[model samples]
Target: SYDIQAWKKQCEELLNLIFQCEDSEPFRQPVDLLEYPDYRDIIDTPMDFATVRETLEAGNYESPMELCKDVRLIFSNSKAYTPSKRSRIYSMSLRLSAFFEEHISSVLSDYKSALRFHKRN
Candidate 1:
């Protein structure tokens, strides 16, 4: 419980660092940010997509992950919070979160390897 709470705070802080999420928020009790309009939506414009290619080409990997992290975690918020079961929706959400994590994890692994390979040069 404590670790999840702590991780939630860390996530909030990271979100703030990227850009302020001033909207008041949570669920079960009362979902604030999730309830708020467009505050936590996974938005990606053509320009946003274009920027990632440009960023990697420009030798910037950190920001790309940070951005993806933001998007990934929102999927986390939407993921089922216990009463955890195998209903289609339940299983689907759990897998959905993992899908994001897996993709990002692969990106992270590749990034670390690339950094290692390139840095030695």
Candidate 2:
């Protein structure tokens, strides 16, 4: 079994990377260039950071992809001013999908014993 603490640390680090990366202007308001109204209302507010953290720690790749799907809905709803903008969003989605696929399962199973015990109580 993998060390739970180590898995937790890695998950946290990856999430921090995502959060910080997403905070940049193009990512932060990706639809702004399209002159669309802020769809922040339609976007899932209270962005479930805890669930994201837990899912990553649990190596729940499916859940993270589902979350990404939810975010993609917002992107699809926003009008893009140029093909480049649309391409960027698509590229981001693909990269995120690859990231989840690459990391989730190993992290989860490695720490599974500790997680199961922690959850059962």
Candidate 3:
């Protein structure tokens, strides 16, 4: 779907920005003038993945729904920081990439499962 593709593109762009920032400024350099963007803007509200998975598996939809809202908010607010703070930005990029991949995979799996269920019924 276009929505999913858009989300994927957004993630890619964010990753690229992080890389661009990091490559231009080495991590060893002092970041006295560096200002890092708010990490929360790119990360979910610090939910434990295992707990989230268990909650979803147990049909605790309310918490999962709240988490999903946070996830979407983070995704929507994603931005690239300046390269002067390359180390931290690159670290965040890697983590966000992993999280994005997992989130996308879960969403796609759920979509497939729903489609299969509807087909059977």
Candidate 4:
């Protein structure tokens, strides 16, 4: 329904916004499992901003929703691993997730069209 390259552009833009988020530091890289041994046990599928970008750059995502799913995993993993909801990491995860969801909604809307519009060189 949507052009892959066009959709990827939107994802790239959204990723830039996510990178700029104040609460984004912890998610920039993969979790150090050695530091938090419980992390490996609890989070079966780990995700992070860097990995998302790597996947995107490799043209691995089929659709925007696919990218959305991976992006969400980062925050969801955070919430699931952290002990207290009031903890700094937990609160930061929620804030970043909200920001990502809101912007990704806009990205999806932009692609919600019958006609295809490819970029002109």
TM-score, every prediction = 0.37, 0.43, 0.30, 0.86
| Model 2 local distance difference test score | 0.51
Best by lDDT: 4
Candidate 3 wrongly placed segments (more than 4 Å): 1-69, 75-90
Candidates 2 and 3, the one with greater lDDT: 2
Per-prediction tally of clashes: 4, 0, 0, 0
Error of 3 at 38 (Å): 11
lDDT agreement with native, every candidate: 0.41, 0.51, 0.42, 0.83
Candidate scoring better on lDDT of 2 and 4: 4
Better of 2 and 4 by TM-score: 4
Clashes of 1: 4
TM-score of 2: 0.43
lDDT string for model 1 (3-117, tens) is 2123223333433432322121121122344554553354332222234334444555444356575455444544423245655545554554454455455445555565566
Candidate 3 lDDT tens digits, 13-110:
43345345433233222222336355445444433333434444455544223445533433233333334435565555456646555655655555
Candidate 3 — which pairs collide? none
TM-score of 4: 0.86
* Model 2 spans with C-alpha error above 4 angstroms: 15-36, 46-86, 117-121
Clashing pairs in 4: none
Query: Which pairs of residues clash in candidate 1, taking residues 3 or more apart in a chain or in different chains?
Result: 25-32, 25-33, 26-31, 26-32
For every candidate in turn, the CA RMSD to the true structure comes to 14.5, 7.2, 11.3, 4.2
